[PDB]
Amino acid sequence: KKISGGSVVEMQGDEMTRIIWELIKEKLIFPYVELDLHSYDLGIENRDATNDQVTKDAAEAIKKHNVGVKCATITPDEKRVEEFKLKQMWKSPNGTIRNILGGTVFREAIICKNIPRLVSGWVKPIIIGHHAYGDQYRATDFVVPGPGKVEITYTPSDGTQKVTYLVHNFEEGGGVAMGMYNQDKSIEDFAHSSFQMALSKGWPLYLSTKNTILKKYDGRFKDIFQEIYDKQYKSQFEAQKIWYEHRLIDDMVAQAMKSEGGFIWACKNYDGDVQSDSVAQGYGSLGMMTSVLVCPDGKTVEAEAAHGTVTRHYRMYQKGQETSTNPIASIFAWTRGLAHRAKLDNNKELAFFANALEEVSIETIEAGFMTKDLAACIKGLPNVQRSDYLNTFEFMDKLGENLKIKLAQAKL
Amino acid sequence: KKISGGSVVEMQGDEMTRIIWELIKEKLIFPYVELDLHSYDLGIENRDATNDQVTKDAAEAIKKHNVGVKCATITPDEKRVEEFKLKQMWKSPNGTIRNILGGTVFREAIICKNIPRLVSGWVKPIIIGHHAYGDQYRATDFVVPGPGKVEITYTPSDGTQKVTYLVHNFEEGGGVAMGMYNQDKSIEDFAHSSFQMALSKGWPLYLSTKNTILKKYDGRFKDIFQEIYDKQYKSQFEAQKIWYEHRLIDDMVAQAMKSEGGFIWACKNYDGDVQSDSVAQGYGSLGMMTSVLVCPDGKTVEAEAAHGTVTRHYRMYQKGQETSTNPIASIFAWTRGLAHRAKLDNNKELAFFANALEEVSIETIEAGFMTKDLAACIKGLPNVQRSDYLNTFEFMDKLGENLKIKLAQAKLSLE
Numbered sequence: 001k002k003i004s005g006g007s008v009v010e011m012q013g014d015e016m017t018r019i020i021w022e023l024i025k026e027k028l029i030f031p032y033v034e035l036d037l038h039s040y041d042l043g044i045e046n047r048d049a050t051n052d053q054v055t056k057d058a059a060e061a062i063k064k065h066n067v068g069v070k071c072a073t074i075t076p077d078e079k080r081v082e083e084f085k086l087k088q089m090w091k092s093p094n095g096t097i098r099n100i101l102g103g104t105v106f107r108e109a110i111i112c113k114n115i116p117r118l119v120s121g122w123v124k125p126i127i128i129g130h131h132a133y134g135d136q137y138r139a140t141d142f143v144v145p146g147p148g149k150v151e152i153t154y155t156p157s158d159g160t161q162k163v164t165y166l167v168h169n170f171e172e173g174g175g176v177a178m179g180m181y182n183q184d185k186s187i188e189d190f191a192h193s194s195f196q197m198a199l200s201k202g203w204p205l206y207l208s209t210k211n212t213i214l215k216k217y218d219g220r221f222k223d224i225f226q227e228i229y230d231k232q233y234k235s236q237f238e239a240q241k242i243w244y245e246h247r248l249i250d251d252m253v254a255q256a257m258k259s260e261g262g263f264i265w266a267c268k269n270y271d272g273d274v275q276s277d278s279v280a281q282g283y284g285s286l287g288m289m290t291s292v293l294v295c296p297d298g299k300t301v302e303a304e305a306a307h308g309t310v311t312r313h314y315r316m317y318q319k320g321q322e323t324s325t326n327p328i329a330s331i332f333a334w335t336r337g338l339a340h341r342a343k344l345d346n347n348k349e350l351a352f353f354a355n356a357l358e359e360v361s362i363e364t365i366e367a368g369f370m371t372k373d374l375a376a377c378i379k380g381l382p383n384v385q386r387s388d389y390l391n392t393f394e395f396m397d398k399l400g401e402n403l404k405i406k407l408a409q410a411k412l
Numbered sequence: 413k414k415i416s417g418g419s420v421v422e423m424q425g426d427e428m429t430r431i432i433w434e435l436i437k438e439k440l441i442f443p444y445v446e447l448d449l450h451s452y453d454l455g456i457e458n459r460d461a462t463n464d465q466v467t468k469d470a471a472e473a474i475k476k477h478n479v480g481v482k483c484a485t486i487t488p489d490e491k492r493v494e495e496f497k498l499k500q501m502w503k504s505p506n507g508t509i510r511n512i513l514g515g516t517v518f519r520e521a522i523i524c525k526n527i528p529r530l531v532s533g534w535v536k537p538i539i540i541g542h543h544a545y546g547d548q549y550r551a552t553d554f555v556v557p558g559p560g561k562v563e564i565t566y567t568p569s570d571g572t573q574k575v576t577y578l579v580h581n582f583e584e585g586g587g588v589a590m591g592m593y594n595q596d597k598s599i600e601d602f603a604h605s606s607f608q609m610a611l612s613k614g615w616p617l618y619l620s621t622k623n624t625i626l627k628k629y630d631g632r633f634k635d636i637f638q639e640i641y642d643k644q645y646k647s648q649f650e651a652q653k654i655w656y657e658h659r660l661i662d663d664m665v666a667q668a669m670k671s672e673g674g675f676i677w678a679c680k681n682y683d684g685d686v687q688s689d690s691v692a693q694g695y696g697s698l699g700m701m702t703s704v705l706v707c708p709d710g711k712t713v714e715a716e717a718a719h720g721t722v723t724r725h726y727r728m729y730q731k732g733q734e735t736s737t738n739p740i741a742s743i744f745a746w747t748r749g750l751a752h753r754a755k756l757d758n759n760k761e762l763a764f765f766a767n768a769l770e771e772v773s774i775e776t777i778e779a780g781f782m783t784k785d786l787a788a789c790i791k792g793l794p795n796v797q798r799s800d801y802l803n804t805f806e807f808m809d810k811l812g813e814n815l816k817i818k819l820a821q822a823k824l825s826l827e
């Protein structure tokens with residue numbers, strides 16, 4: 001009787017999201033879908049036990065099966081080394097996985113009619129993608145201890161004359177200096193992933209840069225996107241009545257603020273971390289922010305929540321205290337992964353199910369059943385009372401009962 | 413009869429803001445205050461006629477008199493060179509003035525109870541400052557045409573060991589590469605200006621950086637701020653029950669979103685342009701965003717609106733079409749400049765007037781009289797009808813009429 005789901009790579013994670021992840025599987029997925037799960041435990045102590053090889057193996061399995069669904073993981077810092085007695089500060093699994101796959105991470109906010117938006121006008125979500133988590137990760141920085149010239153040079157491999165550019169002549173005192181870069185192939189992958197994302201959604205695409213200032217650096221992004229668009233995607237976009245345009249970031253922000261949402265935005269910038277995005281943080285609930293890593297081909301995806309492991313809630317849970325952890329972004333990591341699996345395999349039953357679970361999630365909240373973070377979006381955190389929300393387990397139970405009702409009603 | 417205002421440097425500007433600037437002077441300032449105005453025409457044609465010397469002269473007058481009030485100016489690009497047949501693409505006057513004063517531009521949103529808030533919890537405004545408009549302006553960028561090494565080198569003037577750092581080895585294909593820098597003195601000015609701004613407001617200060625990634629580059633900002641704080645400001649902050657703390661930008665954004673506002677934020681970042689700040693663009697109109705250039709000594713200020721010259725409205729004005737240009741940020745450039753003048757001179761009458769004009773501006777909007785941009789904030793742009801707003805001239809007349817009423821009532825409340 002269960003839906004034949006097919007091959008899905010699953011990456012288990014840490015702390016509160018690891019608890020919610022199991023509730024999702026037990027209550028929302030496994031009662032209705034049978035899957036050929038290729039499970040990789042990306043929990044912090046199994047990552048330490050395999051010297052982070054499990055992360056690389058999981059990344060390779062996604063490349064092989066084209067569908068990944070990942071739970072939030074701990075990115076180690078020095079406290080985590082003291083906490084778990086780690087071998088070394090293992091790098092972010094999110095960073096390791098998208099490096100190995102060569103994809104673009106697109107973020108999307110899950111919208112509910114009763115949850116106020118930062119901008120009232122935004123009727124459809126805005127999907128934003130960044131170039132390999134931002135240029136901040138491709139920087140080489142140092143202290144200039146005193147006077148002297150800082151220069152950036154390019155020495156051709158073919159033996160042609162080197163080109164030197166003056167960064168700054170420090171005439172008196174010191175300062176700081178740094179070098180950043182991008183490879184053409186990485187920009188091309190970013191363009192292809194962005195065009196594929198726009199065609200799969202049936203929404204227009206904008207690329208934003210600061211090409212008025214970084215005329216050469218940002219100009220290259222504008223040129224590569226336009227070249228790829230004209231040659232390969234223009235007719236396909238026209239057929240769906242969508243378009244692609246470059247925008248100076250100044251105009252893009254003003255435009256996005258006056259729009260109704262419903263577009264893809266390839267944002268060329270320095271910091272692609274969701275944590276430092278004031279609009280992502282201003283929505284009031286990181287629990288509603290999902291992410292999808294899309295590839296140039298448009299055939300491989302890895303879906304995960306944009307939020308972290310929710311350590312503060314995990315500490316309450318460890319003491320037997322009630323929590324109200326929002327599972328929506330984690331649920332949409334499963335629905336987005338399953339929707340892609342269903343598309344690749346022409347599995348109408350799995351496609352129907354994946355959409356129904358997203359609908360049930362939104363309808364539950366729209367009917368006034370929600371976690372504390374969402375009740376705080378409506379009333380303001382100081383005005384929230386216990387009767388305004390459901391705890392983590394009550395909310396999962398409500399979704400499970402509404403999903404059973406949705407699928408029972410559908411049989412007719 | 414009129415208030416003796418004292419010495420104020422005035423910089424006239426361009427397009428729609430120049431029109432509003434004159435309406436402010438005629439209707440809101442000159443009927444009540446007498447000023448020793450040191451006027452500099454920073455209009456695009458006069459800047460071109462003096463080869464941008466007027467900009468430098470204005471900056472020097474600000475240093476002497478300590479109070480500047482500036483109108484929005486055109487920053488020339490290739491289209492403007494063609495438009496006005498300019499001799500060269502003159503640099504941003506805002507950038508030139510900031511560079512001469514060694515100041516930091518702090519932005520503040522003007523709040524009206526009836527204009528919806530972006531974050532409900534923000535009961536007090538957040539004042540944000542950037543480092544010399546962001547590092548994007550201190551970049552040297554180029555195309556890497558093909559395979560090869562990109563390296564960044566430092567060659568000491570004293571002849572000691574040259575240090576080379578690999579930016580990237582381009583093995584297959586090309587790409588792009590760039591170098592950015594900051595001078596210590598510029599970071600020190602930024603720290604001093606930020607500490608002075610926090611002390612003058614009586615609000616705590618946060619510096620944000622990405623020092624987890626740019627450990628050397630951003631670490632230098634954290635170190636310079638802490639050094640200066642401990643050496644010249646800790647006791648003064650402690651006396652006012654305020655504090656200074658560095659924050660990783662990730663934590664600062666989460667903290668700011670859960671706060672009540674009421675703090676100064678020195679934001680170390682790449683792009684300090686207001687027009688690419690989603691929060692500045694997300695709340696109200698840029699007509700409600702004012703700015704103040706503050707200097708390391710905490711004595712000199714230059715106030716101006718954070719928005720531009722509003723060229724789209726100027727084109728409507730040039731063709732006799734009605735406009736609805738918000739003058740609030742420009743008015744607050746005058747009130748903030750005059751409030752500083754009053755503080756420096758202990759001029760209670762000018763301090764009282766500057767505050768009364770800010771109150772009249774906010775009260776007018778709160779009583780339902782506003783420009784189209786503000787009516788669209790409340791109703792949503794599609795639902796705005798002509799009867800929901802006042803045109804540029806009607807709004808200035810209403811403010812003028814309400815200012816006359818405010819000052820008449822103040823006199824009648826005496827005895």
Ligand SMILES: NC(=O)c1ccc[n+]([C@@H]2O[C@H](COP(=O)([O-])OP(=O)(O)OC[C@H]3O[C@@H](n4cnc5c(N)ncnc54)[C@H](OP(=O)(O)O)[C@@H]3O)[C@@H](O)[C@H]2O)c1
Pocket residue numbers: 072073074075076274275286287306307308309310311312313324325326327373
């Ligand atoms: N922050 C990120 O986006 C992120 C991404 C990947 C990995 N990580 C890892 O996650 C771990 C914890 O990071 P963190 O605590 O800084 O960030 P976090 O897990 O995203 O939690 C920060 C706070 O946001 C709220 N929150 C986040 N997700 C929520 C949800 N599903 N439902 C309800 N509230 C939610 C909670 O606020 P209240 O405390 O007000 O309830 C929570 O304490 C770290 O080890 C980090 O390496 C973080």
Ligand SMILES: NC(=O)c1ccc[n+]([C@@H]2O[C@H](COP(=O)([O-])OP(=O)(O)OC[C@H]3O[C@@H](n4cnc5c(N)ncnc54)[C@H](OP(=O)(O)O)[C@@H]3O)[C@@H](O)[C@H]2O)c1
Pocket residue numbers: 483484485486487488506687697698699716717718719720721722723724725736737738739785
């Ligand atoms: N000195 C400065 O403070 C400064 C700052 C920024 C730019 N600039 C210069 O100003 C010129 C115009 O640049 P820009 O168009 O990007 O900037 P802008 O003048 O800020 O105008 C952009 C748009 O923002 C809205 N807007 C801004 N201020 C407004 C106000 N007072 N009332 C109502 N709406 C307002 C309008 O939107 P709608 O079109 O939807 O009505 C306007 O078209 C350029 O020459 C630029 O260099 C100078």
Ligand SMILES: C[C@H](Nc1ccc(C#N)n(C)c1=O)c1cc2cc(Cl)ccc2[nH]c1=O
Pocket residue numbers: 107108109111116117118119122124125126127128253256257261277279280283690
């Ligand atoms: C992916 C995310 N999407 C949304 C965030 C918040 C809200 C609200 N309210 N909505 C509707 C989004 O779609 C997003 C949007 C965004 C928009 C602008 Cl103008 C600037 C930065 C943004 N960053 C985001 O992460």
Ligand SMILES: C[C@H](Nc1ccc(C#N)n(C)c1=O)c1cc2cc(Cl)ccc2[nH]c1=O
Pocket residue numbers: 278519520521523528529530531534536537538539540665668669673689691692695
């Ligand atoms: C100077 C400006 N201040 C305000 C903008 C918008 C609103 C609203 N609503 N308020 C209250 C401000 O104080 C500002 C704040 C800001 C805050 C965050 Cl979290 C991020 C970026 C910001 N940029 C701004 O320009």
Ligand SMILES: [Cl-]
Pocket residue numbers: 134269270271272682
């Ligand atoms: Cl950025």
Ligand SMILES: [Cl-]
Pocket residue numbers: 270546681682683684
């Ligand atoms: Cl930035």
